[PDB]
Amino acid sequence: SSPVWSEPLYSLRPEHARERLQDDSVETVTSIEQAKVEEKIQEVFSSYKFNHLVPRLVLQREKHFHYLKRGLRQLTDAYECLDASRPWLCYWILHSLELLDEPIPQIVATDVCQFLELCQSPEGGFGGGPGQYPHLAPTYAAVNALCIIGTEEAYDIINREKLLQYLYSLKQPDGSFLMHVGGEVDVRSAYCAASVASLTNIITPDLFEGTAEWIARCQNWEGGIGGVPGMEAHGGYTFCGLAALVILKRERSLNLKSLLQWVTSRQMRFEGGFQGRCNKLVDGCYSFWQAGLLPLLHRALHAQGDPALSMSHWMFHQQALQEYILMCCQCPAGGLLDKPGKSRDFYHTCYCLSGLSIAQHFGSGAMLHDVVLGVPENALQPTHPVYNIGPDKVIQATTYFLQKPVPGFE
Amino acid sequence: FVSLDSPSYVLYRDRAEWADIDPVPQNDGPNPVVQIIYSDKFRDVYDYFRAVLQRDERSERAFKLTRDAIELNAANYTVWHFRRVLLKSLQKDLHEEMNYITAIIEEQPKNYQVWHHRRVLVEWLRDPSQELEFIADILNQDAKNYHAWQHRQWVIQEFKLWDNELQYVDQLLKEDVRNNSVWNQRYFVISNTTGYNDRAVLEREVQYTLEMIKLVPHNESAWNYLKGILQDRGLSKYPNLLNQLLDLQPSHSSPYLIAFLVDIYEDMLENQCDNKEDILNKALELCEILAKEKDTIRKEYWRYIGRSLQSKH
Numbered sequence: 001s002s003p004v005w006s007e008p009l010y011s012l013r014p015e016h017a018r019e020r021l022q023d024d025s026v027e028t029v030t031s032i033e034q035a036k037v038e039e040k041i042q043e044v045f046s047s048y049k050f051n052h053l054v055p056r057l058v059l060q061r062e063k064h065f066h067y068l069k070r071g072l073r074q075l076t077d078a079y080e081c082l083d084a085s086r087p088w089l090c091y092w093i094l095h096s097l098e099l100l101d102e103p104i105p106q107i108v109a110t111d112v113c114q115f116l117e118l119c120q121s122p123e124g125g126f127g128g129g130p131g132q133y134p135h136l137a138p139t140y141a142a143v144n145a146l147c148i149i150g151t152e153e154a155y156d157i158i159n160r161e162k163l164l165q166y167l168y169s170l171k172q173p174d175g176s177f178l179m180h181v182g183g184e185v186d187v188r189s190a191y192c193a194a195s196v197a198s199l200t201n202i203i204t205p206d207l208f209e210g211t212a213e214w215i216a217r218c219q220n221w222e223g224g225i226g227g228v229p230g231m232e233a234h235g236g237y238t239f240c241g242l243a244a245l246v247i248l249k250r251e252r253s254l255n256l257k258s259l260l261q262w263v264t265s266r267q268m269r270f271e272g273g274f275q276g277r278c279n280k281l282v283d284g285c286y287s288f289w290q291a292g293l294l295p296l297l298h299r300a301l302h303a304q305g306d307p308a309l310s311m312s313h314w315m316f317h318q319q320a321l322q323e324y325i326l327m328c329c330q331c332p333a334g335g336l337l338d339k340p341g342k343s344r345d346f347y348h349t350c351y352c353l354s355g356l357s358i359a360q361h362f363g364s365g366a367m368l369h370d371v372v373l374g375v376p377e378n379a380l381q382p383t384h385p386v387y388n389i390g391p392d393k394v395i396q397a398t399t400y401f402l403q404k405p406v407p408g409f410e
Numbered sequence: 411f412v413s414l415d416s417p418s419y420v421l422y423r424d425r426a427e428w429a430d431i432d433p434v435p436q437n438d439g440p441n442p443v444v445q446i447i448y449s450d451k452f453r454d455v456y457d458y459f460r461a462v463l464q465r466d467e468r469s470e471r472a473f474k475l476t477r478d479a480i481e482l483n484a485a486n487y488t489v490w491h492f493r494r495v496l497l498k499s500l501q502k503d504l505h506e507e508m509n510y511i512t513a514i515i516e517e518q519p520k521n522y523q524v525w526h527h528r529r530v531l532v533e534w535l536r537d538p539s540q541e542l543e544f545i546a547d548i549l550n551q552d553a554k555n556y557h558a559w560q561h562r563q564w565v566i567q568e569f570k571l572w573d574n575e576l577q578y579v580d581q582l583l584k585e586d587v588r589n590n591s592v593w594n595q596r597y598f599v600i601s602n603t604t605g606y607n608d609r610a611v612l613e614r615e616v617q618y619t620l621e622m623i624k625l626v627p628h629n630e631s632a633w634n635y636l637k638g639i640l641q642d643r644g645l646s647k648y649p650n651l652l653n654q655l656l657d658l659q660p661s662h663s664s665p666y667l668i669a670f671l672v673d674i675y676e677d678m679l680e681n682q683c684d685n686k687e688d689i690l691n692k693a694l695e696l697c698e699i700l701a702k703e704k705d706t707i708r709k710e711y712w713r714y715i716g717r718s719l720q721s722k723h
C-alpha cells in the first residue's frame with residue numbers, strides 16, 4: 001500500500017488525460033462549452049497533485065457549517081429572488097446540517113417550526129412564504145424540513161386533513177398533478193405529492209390513480225424521464241419520476257434497463273460529476289439527482305431478484321464523484337457549488353452534500369460498504385434516496401403518522 | 411405607466427391613489443428564520459400586493475401593481491396567478507398581455523411561471539400564430555432551453571403544427587449536431603407524424619444518423635438516437651447493423667461503438683441466436699475492455715452487464 005498521508009486519486013491517474021473531449025475536429029457550441037469546463041477542471045485537479053505526493057482530500061465542514069448557520073437566520077436582499085421559496089431555504093439548510101451531523105439548537109428548531117406554520121395555507125399545503133398560495137414544491141420542502149426536525153411539535157404543524165384535500169384539488173384525470181392551483185404540470189408534482197402523502201400517511205386508493213402510467217409515459221427514447229411526455233430526458237425529472245414510482249411501488253412500469261444505461265452515461269468521464277442531460281455540462285447538484293437514481297434502481301432490481309447486482313457498490317463511479325465534489329465543488333469561504341467559477345448557494349450546498357453521502361455509502365439488505373475518500377472526517381451522515389432526508393428521520397416520521405388515520409377515510 | 415427603475419418612480423406608500431388602502435406587512439413571526447432583508451422598494455410593493463390579494467380587489471391599480479411585483483420577483487407564482495385572475499375580471503386585452511409576457515420571457519427564459527402564463531394566454535386566445543417564431547427566437551439565444559422546447563412540443567401538439575418542424579430540426583442539427591434537445595424533437599416529430607414503423611422512414615432515419623456518426627464519431631446524441639429508434643424492435647433484428655458497426659471498428663472505434671456492440675450481443679443472446687457461446691464470449695470481452703480501458707468511469711455498470719450476461723446465457 002502507500003503512506004497514510006498520501007491517497008492516489010482516480011482523476012489524477014496519468015491515463016485520465018485520455019478522457020478529455022474528442023471533438024472530431026468539428027466544433028459546435030456544445031463541444032466548445034464542454035472543452036472550456038474541462039480545461040478549468042484540469043487546472044483544479046492539477047492543483048491537488050505534487051508529483052508523487054497526493055494529500056488526502058478534505059471536506060471543509062466548519063466553513064460550511066458557519067455558512068449554513070448564518071443563512072438559517074438571515075439573508076441579504078440578493079436572496080429576494082427566493083422570496084417564494086423560503087421553505088426550500090429551511091430544507092436545504094437543515095438537511096445540510098443534518099448530513100454534516102451538526103445539531104439543530106431547539107430554539108432554532110421551534111422557530112423554524114413556527115415559520116413553516118405561517119407558510120401553511122388554510123386550504124392545505126405550504127406556500128413559498130407567509131400568505132403565498134400553496135405550491136407542491138415548497139410543500140415538499142416544508143414537510144421534509146419538519147421531518148428532519150423530528151419533534152412532535154414539528155410533526156403536528158402539518159394539517160393532514162387539508163393536505164389531502166389539497167392534493168386532491170391538484171389531481172388531474174390523466175394521473176398528473178398541477179404544481180399549484182392554476183399552475184403548470186410536470187413530473188415534479190407527482191414526486192412532491194407522493195413524498196408528502198406517504199410520509200404523513202394520507203394516501204388513499206384513488207389519490208394516485210393513473211399517476212404511475214402518466215410517469216411511465218414521461219420515460220422517453222433516451223431511457224431517462226422528461227418533464228412531460230415527449231420531452232427530453234433530464235436528471236431532475238428522472239429522479240422525481242423514479243422516486244415517485246418507488247413510493248407508489250410501481251417501478252416496474254418503467255423500462256429499468258434503458259433507465260440504468262441512461263443515468264450511468266450521465267457521469268462525466270473527465271470531470272467525474274454528473275450532467276443533467278446528454279451533451280450538456282457537469283453540475284454538482286446532479287450529484288444527487290442523477291447519482292441518487294442508482295440506489296433507487298438497485299433497490300428496484302434487487303426487488304425483482306436480479307442475481308448480478310453488486311453487494312458492495314452503486315453502479316456509478318463513487319470515487320470519481322467524490323473527487324469532483326471535494327476538489328471542484330467547495331467554496332473556500334464555505335458552502336458548495338455547481339462547478340468552478342460559480343457562486344455558492346444553499347441549493348447546491350444541499351445537493352452536493354447529498355450526493356457526497358450517496359457516493360460514500362452503499363447498503364442492500366444487511367450489506368453495508370463505505371468508501372470515504374480523503375480524511376475520515378469527510379464521512380457524512382447517510383441520506384434516504386427517495387426522500388433525501390436521513391433514514392432515521394424517515395422511519396421515525398412514517399412511524400408517527402402511521403399511528404394516525406388517513407383523513408376522513410376507512 | 412412608471413417602471414420600477416424609472417427616475418420618476420414613486421413608492422406605493424407615497425402614491426395618493428393608494429392612500430385609501432392600508433398595506434399588509436408580511437408576518438414572519440416573532441423570531442424570524444430564513445428572513446430576507448428586503449430592499450425598501452421590494453417590501454413596499456409586496457406590502458401592497460399582500461393588501462390587495464387579502465381584499466381580493468379586482469382593480470386596475472392592482473393589475474398594474476402586479477407588473478411591479480413581477481419585476482421584483484418573476485418567480486412569485488402567487489402574483490402571476492392573481493394577475494391571471496385580474497386579466498379575466500378586468501377583461502384585459504390578451505394580445506396586450508401576450509406582448510408583455512413576450513418581453514418578460516425574453517429577459518428571463520429560465521423561469522417556470524412565465525412560460526406557464528404564456529401557455530394560459532395562448533389557450534385563452536386559442537391563437538398559436540406567434541408561438542413557433544417566438545420560441546425560435548428564444549431557442550436562438552439558448553438552443554437547449556428546456557421550457558422553450560417543452561412549450562414548443564405543447565403548441566405543435568395542441569394546434570397540430572407539425573408541417574415545418576422537421577425542417578426546423580434539420581436546420582438546428584446543422585447548427586449543432588450535438589444538440590440533444592434537437593435530436594429529441596426529431597424523435598417527437600417523427601413518432602407523431604409518420605411513425606417509425608414505416609420501414610422507409612426507419613431506413614431514412616438510420617442512414618441519416620449513421621452519416622452524422624461518421625462525421626462526428628464521438629457525438630453521443632447521434633448514438634443514443636440510433637439505439638433509441640431501434641431498441642423497441644430489438645437490436646438483433648437488424649443483422650446488417652452489426653456488420654456495418656464492426657467495419658467502423660478500427661477507423662471510428664469509441665466507447666459508444668463498443669457499447670453499442672454489447673447492446674447488440676445482449677439482444678442476440680436474448681433472442682436464441684446461434685453461436686450463443688461465441689456471442690457470449692465476444693460480449694464478455696467487450697464488457698471487460700469497457701470496464702478496464704475504454705469506459706472505466708462506468709466500470710461498475712460494465713461489470714454488472716458482464717455478470718448479467720453470465721446468469722442469463
Ligand SMILES: CC[C@H](C)[C@@H](CO[C@@H](Cc1ccccc1)C(=O)N[C@@H](CCS(C)(=O)=O)C(=O)O)NC[C@@H](N)CS
Binds near residue numbers: 137
Ligand atoms: C426555473 C428553475 C430552473 C429550471 C432550475 C430548477 O428549478 C427546480 C428546482 C428548484 C426548486 C426550488 C428552488 C430552486 C430550484 C424548481 O422546482 N424550480 C421551481 C421552484 C418553485 S418554488 C416556488 O418551490 O421555489 C421554480 O418555479 O423555479 N434548474 C437548475 C439547473 N440549472 C441546475 S442548477
Ligand SMILES: CC(C)=CCC/C(C)=C/CC/C(C)=C/COP(=O)(O)OP(=O)(O)O
Binds near residue numbers: 188192234554555
Ligand atoms: C423536487 C423537485 C422540485 C425537483 C426538481 C429537479 C430539477 C433539478 C429539475 C430541473 C428542471 C429543468 C427544466 C432543468 C433545466 O435547466 P438548465 O438548462 O439550467 O440545466 P441543465 O443545463 O443542467 O440541463
Ligand SMILES: OC[C@H]1O[C@@](CO)(O[C@H]2O[C@H](CO)[C@@H](O)[C@H](O)[C@H]2O)[C@@H](O)[C@@H]1O
Binds near residue numbers: 219253
Ligand atoms: O427508454 C425507452 C422505453 O421507454 C418507454 C416507456 O417506459 O417508451 C418511451 O420510449 C419510446 C422509444 O423507445 C417511445 O416510443 C415512447 O413514446 C416513450 O414513452 C418504453 O416503451 C421503452 O422501451
Ligand SMILES: [Zn+2]
Binds near residue numbers: 286
Ligand atoms: Zn445545479
